[PDB]
Design an enzyme around this catalytic site. Sequence first.
Site, short mmCIF file in Angstrom:
data_model
loop_
_atom_site.label_atom_id
_atom_site.label_comp_id
_atom_site.label_asym_id
_atom_site.label_seq_id
_atom_site.Cartn_x
_atom_site.Cartn_y
_atom_site.Cartn_z
N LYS A 1 -40.25 3.30 39.93
CA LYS A 1 -40.22 1.87 40.27
C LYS A 1 -41.47 1.45 40.98
CE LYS A 1 -35.23 1.76 40.13
NZ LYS A 1 -33.96 2.19 40.76
N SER B 1 -36.07 7.11 40.07
CA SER B 1 -36.49 5.83 40.65
C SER B 1 -37.86 5.84 41.31
CB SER B 1 -35.45 5.34 41.66
OG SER B 1 -34.27 4.95 40.97
N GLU C 1 -33.70 1.59 32.73
CA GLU C 1 -32.54 2.01 33.50
C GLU C 1 -31.27 1.75 32.73
OE1 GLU C 1 -32.66 3.61 36.19
OE2 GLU C 1 -34.53 3.10 37.19
#
EC number: 3.5.2.6
Length: 261
Positions: A46, A43, A139
């Site tokens: 992101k 992550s 994802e």
Amino acid sequence: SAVQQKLAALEKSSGGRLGVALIDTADNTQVLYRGDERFPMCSTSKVMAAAAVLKQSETQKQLLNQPVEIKPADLVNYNPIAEKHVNGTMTLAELSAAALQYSDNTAMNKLIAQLGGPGGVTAFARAIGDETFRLDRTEPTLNTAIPGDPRDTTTPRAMAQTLRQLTLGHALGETQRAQLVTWLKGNTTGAASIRAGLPTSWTVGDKTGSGDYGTTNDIAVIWPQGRAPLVLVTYFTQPQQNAESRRDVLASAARIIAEGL
């Protein structure tokens, strides 16, 4: 140096593979540990998707207020914020905030879609001079973190430089940079990672990541009180596919770095 010996010892004690990059913006000095090895971003990727959308908003001034429908089919494995808005809309700003501050995976996939796929996120990295970052998947499969797999990886050195440019530099417009900084400072998932190894008085903006192979990551900009800011990237991954997360390793690495500045 002392710091690299202590980081190597921390790594040896942990059983995994640790990557660290620190940039001290006071003198542009860098401290690197496995700084040019690839690690799965999970992550932490992101941040790049959100920043790419912010860059688009420099020309499309109203873009962040564009509503995006959240449908049941959009939901993936971890959607703490998007779940609250199924069969409704979220703006691109709300999706960016959710991806960054809650690590919402549906939000990330909407950002990727807005950019035209993972190749659009990667393109933004290239456009700001990051030749290392690569986003290959959406994802949740970008978190597989398979040893040796170059998909969805970057290096600590590259990510530290890119995070510096996005938050402290001018890769983004002034309003966009400020928004990104505000989002990172408001992260809710980082209390046990880099933040836990630093003085409580320091201001931190960070993005965590976690994935298979016990991958436990955090990337941060750090504003010590009365001192130039620092950029710190800590990546950690382990040899067992089902290994548990080790946020304590990131806290310990941050603490070792903070000893010396």
